[PDB]
Amino acid sequence: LGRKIYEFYNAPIVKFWFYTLAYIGYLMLFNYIVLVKMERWPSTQEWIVISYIFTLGIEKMREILMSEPGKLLQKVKVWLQEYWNVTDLIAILLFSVGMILRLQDQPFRSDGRVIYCVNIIYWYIRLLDIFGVNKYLGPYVMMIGKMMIDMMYFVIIMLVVLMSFGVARQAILFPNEEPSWKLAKNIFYMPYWMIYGETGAWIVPAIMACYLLVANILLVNLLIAVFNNTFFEV
Amino acid sequence: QPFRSDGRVIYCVNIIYWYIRLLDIFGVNKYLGPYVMMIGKMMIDMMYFVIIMLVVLMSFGVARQAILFPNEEPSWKLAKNIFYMPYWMIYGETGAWIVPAIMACYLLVANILLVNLLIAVFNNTFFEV
Numbered sequence: 401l402g403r404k405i406y407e408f409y410n411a412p413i414v415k416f417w418f419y420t421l422a423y424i425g426y427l428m429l430f431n432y433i434v435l436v437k438m439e440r441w442p443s444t445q446e447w448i449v450i451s452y453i454f455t456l457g458i459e460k461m462r463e464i465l466m467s468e469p470g471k472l473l474q475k476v477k478v479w480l481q482e483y484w485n486v487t488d489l490i491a492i493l494l495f496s497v498g499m500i501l502r503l504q505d506q507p508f509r510s511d512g513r514v515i516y517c518v519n520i521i522y523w524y525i526r527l528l529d530i531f532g533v534n535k536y537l538g539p540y541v542m543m544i545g546k547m548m549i550d551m552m553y554f555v556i557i558m559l560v561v562l563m564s565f566g567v568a569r570q571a572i573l574f575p576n577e578e579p580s581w582k583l584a585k586n587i588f589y590m591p592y593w594m595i596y597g598e599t600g601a602w603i604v605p606a607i608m609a610c611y612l613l614v615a616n617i618l619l620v621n622l623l624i625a626v627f628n629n630t631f632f633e634v
Numbered sequence: 635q636p637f638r639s640d641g642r643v644i645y646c647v648n649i650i651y652w653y654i655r656l657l658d659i660f661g662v663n664k665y666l667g668p669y670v671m672m673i674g675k676m677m678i679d680m681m682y683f684v685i686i687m688l689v690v691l692m693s694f695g696v697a698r699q700a701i702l703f704p705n706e707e708p709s710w711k712l713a714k715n716i717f718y719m720p721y722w723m724i725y726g727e728t729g730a731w732i733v734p735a736i737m738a739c740y741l742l743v744a745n746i747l748l749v750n751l752l753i754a755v756f757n758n759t760f761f762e763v
C-alpha cells in the first residue's frame with residue numbers, strides 16, 4: 401500500500417491535476433479577501449493566500465538554483481530567459497510590496513489592496529500557460545499570442561484616426577480652457593461614451609460624426625479581417 | 635398558490651424546449667440543415683470560449699467590484715453583481731489614474747481579442763461544415 405501511493409503521487413499526471421486543484425483554491429480564496437473589507441491585521445483567509453505566494457517563492461528559488469548551468473550568473477539568466485517565469489517574479493515582488501503596504505495604518509491599507517487587485521489580474525492571466533495543455537483550448541491561447549502584436553500595431557492606426565475626433569470635438573464643443581489635464585483625459589473618454597453623443601454652423605459637428613462613421617466602420621471591419629487570416633494558419 | 639406560479643414558470647421553460655425541437659425538422663430542408671449542424675459545432679466552440687472569456691472578463695470583474703465598492707461584508711448576492719453588473723455597466727464609467735488602467739485593459743481583450751476570437755472561430759467552423 402505504501403509503494404502504491406508513493407508511486408502515484410510522483411506521477412506527472414497527478415502533479416498536474418493536484419497543483420491546479422491547489423490553485424483553483426488560490427483563485428477562489430483570493431477573490432474572497434479583496435471582495436470583503438480587510439482589517440488592521442490579516443484575517444485567516446488572507447494568511448493562507450499570503451502563505452501561497454511565499455511557498456511559491458521558495459519553489460521558484462529551487463529552479464533558480466537547481467537548473468543545469470553551473471555558474472550562478474547563467475544559472476539565474478536561463479530561468480530569467482523564459483517569459484512566463486519573469487512575470488511570475490515581478491508579480492511575486494508585487495504581492496510582497498502588497499503585504500508591506502497592507503501592514504501599515506491607512507492610507508497604507510488603501511494601497512495594499514490596490515496592489516492586491518492588480519495581482520488578481522495577473523494570476524487569472526497565468527491560466528493561459530496551463531490551458532494550452534488541452535488539445536482544444538491550446539490553439540485559442542496561442543492565437544491570442546499571434547493576434548496580440550497585430551493589435552499593438554492596429555492601435556497605431558486607431559489613435560491616429562479616432563483621437564482625430566477626440567481632440568477636434570474638445571477643440572469645438574469644449575470652450576476655451578487652459579492646460580486643465582482633466583481635458584487631456586476628456587478627449588479620449590468622450591469617444592468611450594460616443595454612443596451617447598450627437599450660415600452653416602451645424603456643418604462641422606455633422607462632418608465630424610460622419611467620417612467618424614466612415615472611420616469606425618472601416619476600422620472595426622479592418623480588424624474583422626486581420627485576425628481572420630491568422631486564425632487560418634494557427 | 636404558491637403552486638400555480640411555480641407551475642407557470644415551468645410551463646414557460648417548456649416553451650423554450652418545445653421551440654428548440656424544430657431543429658430536428660430543419661434537417662429536412664437542404665438549406666436549414668447545414669445551419670443547424672453549424673449551430674451544434676458553434677455550440678461546442680462557444681463552450682471553450684466561455685471558459686476563456688470567464689477567465690479574462692471575471693478577472694476584470696473581480697478587480698472592478700473590488701476597487702469600486704471599496705468595502706463590504708460577506709455578501710450573498712455580490713457574486714450576482716460581479717458578472718451581471720459590469721455587463722450592464724457598458725455605460726458605467728491621488729491615484730485616480732489606476733482605475734482607468736483597469737478600465738483600459740478591461741476592453742483591451744474582452745472585445746478587441748475575445749469578441750473577435752469568436753468571429754474567427756465561428757468562421758473556422760463555417761469552412762469545414
Ligand SMILES: Cc1cc(NC(=O)[C@H](c2ccccc2)N2CCCc3ccccc32)no1
Nearest residue numbers: 419420422423426452453456459526527530
Ligand atoms: C500563488 C500560486 C501560483 C500557483 N501556481 C502556479 O504559478 C503554477 C501552476 C499553474 C497552474 C496550475 C498549477 C500550477 N505552478 C505552481 C508551482 C510552480 C510551477 C512551476 C511550473 C509550472 C507551474 C507552476 N500556485 O500558487
